[PDB]
mmCIF file of C-alpha atoms and ligand atoms in Angstrom:
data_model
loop_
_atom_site.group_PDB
_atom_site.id
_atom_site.type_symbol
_atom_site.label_atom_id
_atom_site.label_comp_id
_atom_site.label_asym_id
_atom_site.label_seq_id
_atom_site.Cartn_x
_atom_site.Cartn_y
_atom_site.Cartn_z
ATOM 1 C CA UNK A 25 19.231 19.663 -2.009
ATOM 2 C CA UNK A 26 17.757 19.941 -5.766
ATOM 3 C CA UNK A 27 19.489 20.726 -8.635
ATOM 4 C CA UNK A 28 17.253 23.378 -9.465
ATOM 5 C CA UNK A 29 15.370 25.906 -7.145
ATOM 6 C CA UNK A 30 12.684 26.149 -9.235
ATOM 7 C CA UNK A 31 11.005 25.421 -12.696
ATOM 8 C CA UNK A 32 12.269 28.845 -14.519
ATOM 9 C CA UNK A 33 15.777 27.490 -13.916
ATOM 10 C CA UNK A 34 15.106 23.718 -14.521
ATOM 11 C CA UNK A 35 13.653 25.328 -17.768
ATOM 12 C CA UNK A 36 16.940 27.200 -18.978
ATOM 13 C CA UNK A 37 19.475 24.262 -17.722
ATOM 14 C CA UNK A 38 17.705 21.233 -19.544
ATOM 15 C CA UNK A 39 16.675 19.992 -22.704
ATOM 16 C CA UNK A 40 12.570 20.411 -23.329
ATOM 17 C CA UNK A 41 12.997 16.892 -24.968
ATOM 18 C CA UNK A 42 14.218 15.213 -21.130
ATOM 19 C CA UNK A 43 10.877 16.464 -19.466
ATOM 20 C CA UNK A 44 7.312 16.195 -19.936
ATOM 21 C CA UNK A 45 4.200 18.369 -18.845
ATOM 22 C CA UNK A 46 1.179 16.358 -18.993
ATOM 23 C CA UNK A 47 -2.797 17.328 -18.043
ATOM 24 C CA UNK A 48 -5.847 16.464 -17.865
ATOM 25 C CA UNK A 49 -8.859 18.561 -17.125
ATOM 26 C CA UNK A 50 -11.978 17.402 -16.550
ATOM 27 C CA UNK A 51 -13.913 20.073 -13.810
ATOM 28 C CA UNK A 52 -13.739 17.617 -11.040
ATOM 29 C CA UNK A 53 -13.128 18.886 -7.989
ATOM 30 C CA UNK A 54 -10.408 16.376 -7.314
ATOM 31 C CA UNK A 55 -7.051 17.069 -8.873
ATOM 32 C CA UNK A 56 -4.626 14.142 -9.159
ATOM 33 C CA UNK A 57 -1.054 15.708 -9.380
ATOM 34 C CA UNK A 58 2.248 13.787 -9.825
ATOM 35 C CA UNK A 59 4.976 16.205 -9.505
ATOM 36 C CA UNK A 60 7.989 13.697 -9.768
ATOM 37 C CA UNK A 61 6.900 11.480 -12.928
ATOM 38 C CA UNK A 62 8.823 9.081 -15.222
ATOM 39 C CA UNK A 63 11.814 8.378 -14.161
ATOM 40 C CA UNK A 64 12.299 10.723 -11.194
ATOM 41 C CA UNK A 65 10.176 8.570 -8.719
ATOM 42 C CA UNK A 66 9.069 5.244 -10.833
ATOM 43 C CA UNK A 67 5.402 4.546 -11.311
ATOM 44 C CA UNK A 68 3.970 7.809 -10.133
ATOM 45 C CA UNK A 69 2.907 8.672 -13.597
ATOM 46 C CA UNK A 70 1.667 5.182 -13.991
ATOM 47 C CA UNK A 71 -0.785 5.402 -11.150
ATOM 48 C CA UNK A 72 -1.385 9.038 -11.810
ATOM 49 C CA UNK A 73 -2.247 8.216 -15.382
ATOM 50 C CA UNK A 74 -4.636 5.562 -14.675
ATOM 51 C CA UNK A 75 -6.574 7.759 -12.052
ATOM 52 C CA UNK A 76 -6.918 9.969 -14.874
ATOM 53 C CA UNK A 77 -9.338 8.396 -16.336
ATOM 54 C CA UNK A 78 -11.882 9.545 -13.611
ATOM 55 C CA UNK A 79 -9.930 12.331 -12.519
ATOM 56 C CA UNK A 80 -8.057 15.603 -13.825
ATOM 57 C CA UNK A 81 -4.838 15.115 -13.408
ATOM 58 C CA UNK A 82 -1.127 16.938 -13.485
ATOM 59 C CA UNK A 83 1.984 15.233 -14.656
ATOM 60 C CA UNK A 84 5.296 16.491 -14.814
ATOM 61 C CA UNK A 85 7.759 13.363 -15.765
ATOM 62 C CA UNK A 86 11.386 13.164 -16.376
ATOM 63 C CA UNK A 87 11.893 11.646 -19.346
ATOM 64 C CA UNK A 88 15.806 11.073 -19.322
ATOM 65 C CA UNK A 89 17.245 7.724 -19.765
ATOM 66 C CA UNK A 90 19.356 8.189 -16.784
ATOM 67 C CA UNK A 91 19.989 10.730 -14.672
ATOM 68 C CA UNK A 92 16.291 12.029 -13.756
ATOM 69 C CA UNK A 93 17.419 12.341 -10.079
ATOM 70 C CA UNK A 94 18.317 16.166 -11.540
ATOM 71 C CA UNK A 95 15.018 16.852 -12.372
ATOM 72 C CA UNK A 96 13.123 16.441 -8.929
ATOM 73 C CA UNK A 97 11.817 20.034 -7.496
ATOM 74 C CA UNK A 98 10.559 19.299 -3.910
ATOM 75 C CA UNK A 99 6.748 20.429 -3.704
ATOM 76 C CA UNK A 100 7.811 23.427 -1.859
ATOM 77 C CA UNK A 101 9.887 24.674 -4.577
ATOM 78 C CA UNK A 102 7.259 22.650 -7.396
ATOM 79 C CA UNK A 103 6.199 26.042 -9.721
ATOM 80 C CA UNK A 104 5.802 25.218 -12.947
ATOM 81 C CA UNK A 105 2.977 27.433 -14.633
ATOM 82 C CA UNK A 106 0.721 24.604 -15.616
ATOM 83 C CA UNK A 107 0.699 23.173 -12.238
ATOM 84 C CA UNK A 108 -0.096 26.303 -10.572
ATOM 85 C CA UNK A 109 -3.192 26.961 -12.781
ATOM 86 C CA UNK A 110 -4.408 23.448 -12.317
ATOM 87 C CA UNK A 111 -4.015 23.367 -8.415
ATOM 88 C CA UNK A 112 -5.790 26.906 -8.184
ATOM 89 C CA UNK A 113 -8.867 25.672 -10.561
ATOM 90 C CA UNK A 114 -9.601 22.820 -8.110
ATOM 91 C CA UNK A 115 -11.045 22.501 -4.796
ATOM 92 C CA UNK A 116 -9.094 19.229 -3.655
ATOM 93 C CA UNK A 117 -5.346 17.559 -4.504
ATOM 94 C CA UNK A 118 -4.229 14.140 -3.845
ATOM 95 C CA UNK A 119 -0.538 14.515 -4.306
ATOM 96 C CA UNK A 120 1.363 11.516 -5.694
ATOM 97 C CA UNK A 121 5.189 10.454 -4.371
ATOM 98 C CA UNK A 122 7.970 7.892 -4.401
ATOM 99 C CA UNK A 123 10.398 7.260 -1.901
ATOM 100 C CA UNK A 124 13.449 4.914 -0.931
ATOM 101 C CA UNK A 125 13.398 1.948 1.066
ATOM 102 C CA UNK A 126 12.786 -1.837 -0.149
ATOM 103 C CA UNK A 127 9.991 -3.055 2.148
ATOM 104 C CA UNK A 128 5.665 -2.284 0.506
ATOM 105 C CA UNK A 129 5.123 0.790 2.477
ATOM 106 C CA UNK A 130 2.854 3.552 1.820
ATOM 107 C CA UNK A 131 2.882 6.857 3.853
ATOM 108 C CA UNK A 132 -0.382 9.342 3.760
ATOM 109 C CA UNK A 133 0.166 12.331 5.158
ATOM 110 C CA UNK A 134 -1.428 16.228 3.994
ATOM 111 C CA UNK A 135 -3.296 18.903 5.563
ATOM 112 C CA UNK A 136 -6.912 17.073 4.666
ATOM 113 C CA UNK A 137 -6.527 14.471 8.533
ATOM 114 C CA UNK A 138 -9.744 13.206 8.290
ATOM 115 C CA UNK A 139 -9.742 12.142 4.117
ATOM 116 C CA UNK A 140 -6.334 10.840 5.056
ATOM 117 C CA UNK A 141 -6.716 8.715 8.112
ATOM 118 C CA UNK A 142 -10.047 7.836 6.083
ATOM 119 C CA UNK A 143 -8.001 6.381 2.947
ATOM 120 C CA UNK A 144 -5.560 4.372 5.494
ATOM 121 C CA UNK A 145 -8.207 2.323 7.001
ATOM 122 C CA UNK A 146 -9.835 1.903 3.609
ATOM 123 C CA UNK A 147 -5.773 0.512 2.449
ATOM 124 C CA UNK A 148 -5.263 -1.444 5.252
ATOM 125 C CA UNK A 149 -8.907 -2.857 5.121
ATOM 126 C CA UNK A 150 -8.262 -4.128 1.771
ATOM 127 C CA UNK A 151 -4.742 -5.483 2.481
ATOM 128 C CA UNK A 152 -2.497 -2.145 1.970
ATOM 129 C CA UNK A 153 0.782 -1.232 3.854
ATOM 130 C CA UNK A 154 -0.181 2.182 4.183
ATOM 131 C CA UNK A 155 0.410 4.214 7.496
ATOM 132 C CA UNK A 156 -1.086 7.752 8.483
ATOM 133 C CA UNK A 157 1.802 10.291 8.721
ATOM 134 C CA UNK A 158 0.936 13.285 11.510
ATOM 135 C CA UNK A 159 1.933 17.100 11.321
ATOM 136 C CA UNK A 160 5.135 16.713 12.715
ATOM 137 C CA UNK A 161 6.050 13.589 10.498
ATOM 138 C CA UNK A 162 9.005 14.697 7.641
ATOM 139 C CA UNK A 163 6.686 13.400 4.752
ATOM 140 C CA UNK A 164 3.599 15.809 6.269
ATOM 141 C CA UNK A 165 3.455 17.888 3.261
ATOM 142 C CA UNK A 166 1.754 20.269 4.948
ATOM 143 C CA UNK A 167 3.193 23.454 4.149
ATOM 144 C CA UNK A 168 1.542 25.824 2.266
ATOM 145 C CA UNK A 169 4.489 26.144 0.292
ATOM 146 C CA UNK A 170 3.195 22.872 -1.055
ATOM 147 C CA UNK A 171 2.181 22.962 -4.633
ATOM 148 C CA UNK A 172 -0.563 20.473 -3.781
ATOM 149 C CA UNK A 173 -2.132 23.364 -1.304
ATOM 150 C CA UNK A 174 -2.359 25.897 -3.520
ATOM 151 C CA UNK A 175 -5.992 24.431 -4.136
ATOM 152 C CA UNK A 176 -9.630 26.370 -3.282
ATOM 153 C CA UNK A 177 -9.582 24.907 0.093
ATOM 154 C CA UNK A 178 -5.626 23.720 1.281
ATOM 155 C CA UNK A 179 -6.940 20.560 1.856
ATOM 156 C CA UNK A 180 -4.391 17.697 0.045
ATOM 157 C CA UNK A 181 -4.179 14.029 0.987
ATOM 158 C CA UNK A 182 0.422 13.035 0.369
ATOM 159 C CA UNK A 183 0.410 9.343 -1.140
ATOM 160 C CA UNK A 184 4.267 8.862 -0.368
ATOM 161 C CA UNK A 185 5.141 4.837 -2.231
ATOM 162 C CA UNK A 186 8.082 2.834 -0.944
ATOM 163 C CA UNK A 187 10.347 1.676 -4.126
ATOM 164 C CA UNK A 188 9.339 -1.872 -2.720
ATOM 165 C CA UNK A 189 5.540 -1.016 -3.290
ATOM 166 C CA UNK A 190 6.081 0.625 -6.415
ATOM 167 C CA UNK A 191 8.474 -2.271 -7.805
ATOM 168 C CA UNK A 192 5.304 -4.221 -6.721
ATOM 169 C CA UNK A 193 2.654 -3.230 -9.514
ATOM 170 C CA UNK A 194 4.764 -3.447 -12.537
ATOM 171 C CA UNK A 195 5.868 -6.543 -14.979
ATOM 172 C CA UNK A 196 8.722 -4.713 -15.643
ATOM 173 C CA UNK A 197 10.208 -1.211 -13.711
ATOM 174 C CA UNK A 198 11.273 0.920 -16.415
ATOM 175 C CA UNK A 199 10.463 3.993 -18.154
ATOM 176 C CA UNK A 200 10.054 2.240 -21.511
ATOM 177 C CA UNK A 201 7.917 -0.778 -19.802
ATOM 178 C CA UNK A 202 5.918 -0.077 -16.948
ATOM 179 C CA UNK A 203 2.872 1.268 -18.522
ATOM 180 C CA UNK A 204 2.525 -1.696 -20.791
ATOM 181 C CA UNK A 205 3.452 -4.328 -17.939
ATOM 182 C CA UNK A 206 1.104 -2.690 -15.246
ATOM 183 C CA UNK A 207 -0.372 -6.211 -13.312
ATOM 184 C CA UNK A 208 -3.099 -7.676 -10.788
ATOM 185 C CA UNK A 209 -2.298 -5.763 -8.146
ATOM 186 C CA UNK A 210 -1.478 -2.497 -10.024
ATOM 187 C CA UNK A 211 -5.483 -2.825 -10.710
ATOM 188 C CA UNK A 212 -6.710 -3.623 -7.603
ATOM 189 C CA UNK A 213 -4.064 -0.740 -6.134
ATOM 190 C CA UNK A 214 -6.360 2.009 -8.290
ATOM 191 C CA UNK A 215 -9.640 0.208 -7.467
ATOM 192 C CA UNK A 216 -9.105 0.819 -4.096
ATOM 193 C CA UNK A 217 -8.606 4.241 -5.228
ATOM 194 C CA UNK A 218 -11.273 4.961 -7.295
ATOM 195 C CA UNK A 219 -13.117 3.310 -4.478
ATOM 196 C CA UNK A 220 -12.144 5.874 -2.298
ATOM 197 C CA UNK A 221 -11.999 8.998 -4.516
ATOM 198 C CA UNK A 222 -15.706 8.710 -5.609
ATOM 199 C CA UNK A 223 -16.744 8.337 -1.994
ATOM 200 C CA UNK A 224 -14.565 10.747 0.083
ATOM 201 C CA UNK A 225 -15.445 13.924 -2.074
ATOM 202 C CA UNK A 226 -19.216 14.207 -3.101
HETATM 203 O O1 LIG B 18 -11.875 1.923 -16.544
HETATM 204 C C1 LIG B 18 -11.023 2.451 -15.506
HETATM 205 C C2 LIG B 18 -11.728 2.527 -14.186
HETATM 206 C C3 LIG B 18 -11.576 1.508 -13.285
HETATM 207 C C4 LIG B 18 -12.225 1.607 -12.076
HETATM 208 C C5 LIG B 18 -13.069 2.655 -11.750
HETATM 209 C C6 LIG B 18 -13.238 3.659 -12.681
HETATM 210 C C7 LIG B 18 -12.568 3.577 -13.899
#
């Protein structure tokens, strides 16, 4: 259970200095959304940001020094205006997450099966710990509750990151240092992305 059932409340109950809405639009059909940024789930907005450079993106980050645990909205619950406008102007989503457990894992779910079974053999080709989730899977995110849904089409690919592969990319896991400690395998991470994103959606 969240703190807060949605972002009008998280709005009232915290500081606009502990949280951060961050876009990017550049009228590609891809949107690159990161939902739980900064410290809520740790190097989402470090991968989301470095997409960005190809892609539009959404960030929403929690920006406390401790504590950002309060600021996660599930993406069922995930409302905030900006993010609804950006997920409605696009035609695709690729929905960025974090979740607990030590061992490199990544988990690819969404309602887009063949993009996502797709971008697990292209991970696992290139030496990726990445598994295809299926409807039924917890970590589906296929409700169309889902922010990352409310696109032109409903079709989303879920990038769900163990702590152990996000722990993986960075010189140092912090809020303060990962974006200026990002490493070899951060880069080759987002190649393989970039990889896939300019080939999957033409
Ligand atoms: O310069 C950043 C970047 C890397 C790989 C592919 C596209 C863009």
């Amino acid at each position: 259970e969240d703190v807060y059932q949605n972002f009008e409340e998280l709005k009232n109950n915290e500081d606009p200095s502990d949280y951060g809405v961050v876009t990017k639009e550049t009228g590609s059909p891809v949107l690159v959304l990161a939902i739980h940024g900064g410290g809520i789930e740790g190097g989402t907005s470090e991968v989301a940001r470095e997409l960005s450079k190809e892609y539009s993106m959404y960030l929403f980050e929690g920006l406390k020094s401790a504590g950002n645990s309060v600021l996660h909205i599930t993406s069922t619950h995930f409302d905030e205006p900006r993010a609804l406008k950006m997920t409605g102007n696009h035609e695709y989503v690729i929905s960025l997450h974090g979740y607990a457990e030590e061992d490199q894992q990544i988990e690819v779910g969404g309602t887009d099966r063949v993009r996502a079974a797709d971008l697990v053999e292209k991970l696992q080709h290139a030496g990726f710990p990445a598994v295809l989730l299926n409807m039924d899977h917890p970590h589906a995110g296929v409700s169309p509750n889902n922010i990352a849904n409310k696109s032109k089409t409903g079709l989303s690919i879920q990038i769900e990151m163990s702590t152990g592969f996000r722990k993986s990319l960075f010189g140092i896991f912090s809020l303060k240092s990962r974006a200026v400690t990002q490493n070899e395998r951060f880069y080759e991470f987002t190649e393989v992305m970039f990889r896939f994103l300019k080939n999957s959606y033409l």
